[PDB]
């Protein structure tokens, strides 16, 4: 819980407990018992709302797909939505293990092939990949029931990389990859319907769980413009004579006058 | 410059006429693209000792080793089996030397 | 031209006058290299792996023969050294020639992260191992040849984990 | 007060604050229980952790901002720059000094910091990496040179904005990494100890830049009563408990 | 305290303020 | 675990860890303690991913069958998937119990007649021998439900023949059966829908249970031709003037320099 | 047998004899009741302390010898190299190894001997210093080329008679030195383990060659019965137990 | 650690490396 309030008579003290420093890099401690006359006051709220755990850990949606030909694929990455790549920029490194779930309007009979990293997923129904020996897949019929499945950490690391400020090639490569994109892939997810019924709109919702939050970061305050990319000057007219100009597309409101508002 | 393809091992029939072939080998010219030295490459030396070998020419950076028959094979007298060294050599001049093993067969 | 053959299991070596790099095998358990053998064939079905190779160099000549051989190993993230003088700066071992024949680097567990992609890629390579003329091989004739194997086994502490697909095998047809 | 000596190398202040310690933690070597490799890592420990001073920088009216990398800014900084071509991994807790001092005319301030993975952004439109040549700039540091719609877009040029840290985040909430302030009117000098933050034991000291140090000009240099209209700044930084692991040759080329 | 699947990661959800706020020496 | 890396100092010794032989048939015990100087390193990677247990036990995919007149028929074997087919022929010798899941796209009402050796099956949907009375058969419904039911080993022997050099009528004989064909059947499957809703594709994913592998073998090194038969020489085109072609069909890649690669 | 691991790297021998320690002592470090700077002293430990493999040398008919200076001749050889011009003073002891196997068929020998402040006469005449460039050839060696009347006189050319020791003291009293003979009869190899062989604590690696590595073809090799009329000699110098103290820029131009 | 089933048979998955590696007298 949070501490309760102390109560706090007239003081005449000479060492101020509001003169703090700014420069020095620290947040003063000064609690409202320093500047005026408190009550004590039985106070009992709890910021356990916010805790790491519960403040991640909602299961959110990752990544939307639909089936084409009965057959669609995504790479797993929380790069696509920005609401929570927002949350999850918050933090440089975190470590989680993670609970997908499918939320598919198809009917019928699904499967979902979790592909390892490093070989050849099916490109397409009906292809002979999908028979595996070893790859682990997920049969379910969408009417009566949502898959559910944890993904432990596979991290090669003891952490996930949200921020990486380095590349995986030395200086005098050629194709060198900038950010997080060459540090982890987590697999990917491979659908397809043996049926013919439903819908094709497949929603992954994926929790992060066992979460431990490693550096914070100021929370990003520009919309996103590509992913695994950390852009974003926003070019919104590719075609018309004026693609060399870039949007910025902050939150920052303006009002008309201080010392007004 | 690099052999290439020259680690390897050559078969020769017993009862083989002059000219046949053992082997197919190139060379790559150590990307400054120096030319080989026009009697190169040649084989210095073989394993017990040897002729009816000689390295052609095939169109273009492509060699070959072909028998020339100054010496029958007789694998059911020896010797049986070659160890041929090639040697090329550029303009600039930087050698390489690569062993082609050669077995002759059983003709029966 | 030899694989099919026998004769891709070794290679020949003979008596040069300078050094030459003889053989570089890129430590990356999805090469052919490994992921033919017992080790690369069974770490092919797992996405990651980590620890220590054995790699047993020997060498097959008469009993005359002698020579010496510098087998490096050049760490992850260095590139292929080829001149002795740059390889011998990493994981090297010096292996003579005589009543015995065969010897073995022991390929260390040199690595940032905690596991190694089976699947070779630039973030997490895993380096080389290139076999080099010390001295020479000096055959009791003058052009005598040897022929060297290798072979690779996994030290107590290799791990593996991510069991997956091996790419090491493929079913095209409808086995009737 | 204030002195603090590392190997052969002193640094001495007189109107210095509370050095600032980034995240309560002091650089630590790696324990066993936390060790991935097998090889036994060198500890220089006397001539590689010393105070480098790289190259000093002017503080103008207008001037916007400068960030190094690190450790890309010591790369050829004695036997720890030579240490760091010369072995396949390496670890390092660092003790970065910042120096800026002009009289009792001048008013400005300086928001010093140090970002742990400043993923630099495009400086736009396409997806396209920023360049190698350009996130490590060595010891030279890298003006700012503030935002524009004319700033050039070839070769994977890095974001010139300071108010949005280069990256996407707004300034100000900067102040969440280990930072402190270079007042003119209050102090004229910034110490930091930062241990080695990053999610592995060691990684390459090329390849990757665990830090990054960005110097800002919250408030700019009023000359005030007095014809001096800049000031130089000097980033005088030291590893420390600095060890590196996997010989090999030299990176260079 | 059940734990089904007999695994740790198939669990829930698990469970000082000054390393910021103060970073001083 | 795996066991902990020990510190090595540097050592002048007379008796050489890493000069060992090839020639004797076994294995180097050289760890890189013997190379170079380590340092302690408290290492606790499991292997337990790798045990036959979790590596066999996966419920792959066995055999599909198609449903022609609401009826099919599938004789148990591991011999039509190559991908388990490879993991199998890693062993010699395997004692496992097998649980058999029908994974079928069809709707309405199934029925599953587990066959024991030596009987004759049903011909066909409405045959009279699907009224039994000892046969095990299952009955499921495929919408709200997957059928699953374990066959214990049913062996003839201690373990299963993967490979066996025999053949099982004397020398004069004239249908001598080489391999492991006549060793074992494991009885069949005979599937028929009593209604007439779904599709008719039916997939069997069997996972092998309380395995015990027996002898190591290099694992298979070639695309198979044929089923209980270990040839690998494909003949790709019977019809065309070259059917006396015979392809191989290895995985050996090759490289164009060896020192280069 | 034998087996020699420094840090990262290993030697190996089969026919080798009874390693020679060089009077008798291992290469330690400065004990400080020896010491006479105050500087803490850096110790590598690992990236300097193992065997650089210099270049192979031919041994012909007619070769008359090879003298390596040290550390001179690892004076670019990694981070060894990196210290010794990066620090104003060094010690170290040395571990040479000496590798040359030819045959059953071949003969001959070597003695392979190791000079504390090998001076080298000058090339004859006039008193002349021996030039800087020709005592510190670096890790190439420098081959004799035998006495003549002949040989150049200018630049000061150290002297090339192998039998004077190139000093003036007779060959075969060398044997006074710590030394080996390889004799392609009975061994194919030579370890000589050398400590710090100095007057004075530490100097400077650059001006100052404490050791001399001299390899002298004692007997001729005859090829015998067999096409191979020459054999390369390797020789694998690894630093122990060295310390550089006095950090300061590399005395490189 | 129940076995619904009343069977050994039906129970989930159950749970020295020098018999190769070295396999001399």
């Known amino acids: 819980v949070v501490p309760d309030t102390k109560p706090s008579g007239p003081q005449h003290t000479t060492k101020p407990s509001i003169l703090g420093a700014m420069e020095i890099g620290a947040s003063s401690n000064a609690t409202p018992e320093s500047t005026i006359e408190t009550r004590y006051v039985y106070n009992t709220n709890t910021n356990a709302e916010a805790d790491v755990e519960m403040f991640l850990g909602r299961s959110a949606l990752w990544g939307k797909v639909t089936l084409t030909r009965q057959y669609a694929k995504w790479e797993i990455n929380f790069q696509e939505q920005a609401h929570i790549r927002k949350k999850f920029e918050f933090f440089t490194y975190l470590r989680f293990d993670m609970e997908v779930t499918i939320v598919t309007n198809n009917k019928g009979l699904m499967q979902i092939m979790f592909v390892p990293p490093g070989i050849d997923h099916p490109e397409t129904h009906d292809d002979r990949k999908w028979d595996s020996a070893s790859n682990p897949s997920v049969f379910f019929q969408p009417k009566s029931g949502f898959p559910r499945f944890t993904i432990p950490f596979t991290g090669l690391a003891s952490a996930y990389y949200m921020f990486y400020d380095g590349y995986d090639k030395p200086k005098g490569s050629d194709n060198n990859e900038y950010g997080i994109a060459p540090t982890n892939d987590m697999g990917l997810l491979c659908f397809r319907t043996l049926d013919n019924s439903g819908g094709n709109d497949v929603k992954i919702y994926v929790k992060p769980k066992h979460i431990t939050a490693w550096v914070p970061r100021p929370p990003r305050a520009t919309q996103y413009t590509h992913k695994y990319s950390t852009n974003y000057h926003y070019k919104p007219n590719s075609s018309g004579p004026d693609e060399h100009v870039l949007k910025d597309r902050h939150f920052i409101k303006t009002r008309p006058l201080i010392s007004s508002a | 410059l690099h052999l290439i393809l020259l680690p390897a091992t050559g078969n020769v029939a017993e009862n083989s006429p002059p000219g046949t072939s053992v082997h197919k080998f190139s060379v790559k010219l150590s990307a400054s693209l120096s030319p080989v030295i026009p009697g190169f490459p040649q084989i210095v030396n073989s394993n017990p000792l040897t002729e009816a070998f000689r390295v052609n020419w095939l169109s273009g950076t492509y060699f070959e080793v072909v028998t020339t028959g100054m010496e029958q094979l007789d694998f059911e007298t020896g010797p049986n089996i070659f160890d041929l060294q090639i040697y090329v050599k550029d303009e600039v001049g930087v050698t390489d030397l690569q062993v082609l093993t050669v077995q002759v067969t059983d003709v029966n | 031209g030899e694989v099919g053959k026998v004769s891709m299991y070794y290679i020949t070596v003979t008596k040069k006058t300078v050094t030459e790099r003889i053989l570089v095998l890129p430590l990356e358990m999805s090469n052919t290299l490994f992921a033919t053998t017992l080790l690369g064939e069974v770490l092919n079905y797992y996405a990651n792996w980590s620890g220590s190779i054995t790699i047993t160099f020997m060498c097959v000549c008469d009993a005359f023969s002698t020579g010496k051989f510098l087998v490096a190993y050049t760490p992850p993230g260095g590139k292929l050294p080829e001149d002795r003088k740059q390889a011998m700066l990493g994981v090297h071992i010096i292996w003579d020639l005589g009543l015995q024949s065969s010897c073995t680097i022991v390929v260390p567990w040199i690595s940032s992260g905690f596991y190694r992609r089976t699947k070779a890629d630039s973030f997490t390579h895993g380096g080389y191992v290139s076999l080099w003329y010390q001295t020479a091989f000096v055959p009791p004739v003058s052009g005598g040849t040897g022929s060297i194997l290798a072979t690779c086994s996994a030290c107590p502490d290799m791990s593996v984990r991510m069991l997956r697909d091996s790419p090491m095998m493929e079913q095209k047809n409808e086995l009737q | 007060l204030k002195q603090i000596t590392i190997g052969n190398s002193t640094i001495t202040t007189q109107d210095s604050l509370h050095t600032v310690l980034a995240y309560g933690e002091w650089p630590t070597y790696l324990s066993d229980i936390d060790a991935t490799s097998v090889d036994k890592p060198t500890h220089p420990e006397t001539s590689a952790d010393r105070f480098y001073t790289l190259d000093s920088v002017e503080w103008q009216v207008g001037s916007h901002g400068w960030w190094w990398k690190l450790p890309d800014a010591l790369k050829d900084m004695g036997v720890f720059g030579q240490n760091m071509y010369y072995h396949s991994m390496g670890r390092s807790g660092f003790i970065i000094h910042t120096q800026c001092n002009a009289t009792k005319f001048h008013s400005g301030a300086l928001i010093v910091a140090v970002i742990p993975e400043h993923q630099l952004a495009y400086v736009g439109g396409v997806k396209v990496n920023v360049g190698y040549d350009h996130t490590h700039p060595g010891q030279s540091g890298h003006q700012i040179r503030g935002p524009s719609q004319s700033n050039d877009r070839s070769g994977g040029k890095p974001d010139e904005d300071p108010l949005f840290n280069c990256n996407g985040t707004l300034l100000g909430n900067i102040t969440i990494f280990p930072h402190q302030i270079i007042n003119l009117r209050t102090n004229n000098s910034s110490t930091i100890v930062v241990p080695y933050i990053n999610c592995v034991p060691m990684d390459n000291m090329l390849k990757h830049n665990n830090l990054s140090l960005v110097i800002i000009p919250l408030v700019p240099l009023r000359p005030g009563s007095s014809g001096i209209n800049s000031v130089p700044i000097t980033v005088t930084i030291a590893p420390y408990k600095s060890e590196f692991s996997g010989a090999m040759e030299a990176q260079r080329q | ?25």
Chains 1, 6 share one sequence.
Request: zero cysteines.
């Open chain 5, 1 to 25: 305290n059940i734990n089904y699947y007999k695994d740790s990661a198939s669990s829930g959800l698990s469970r000082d303020p000054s390393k910021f706020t103060q970073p001083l020496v």
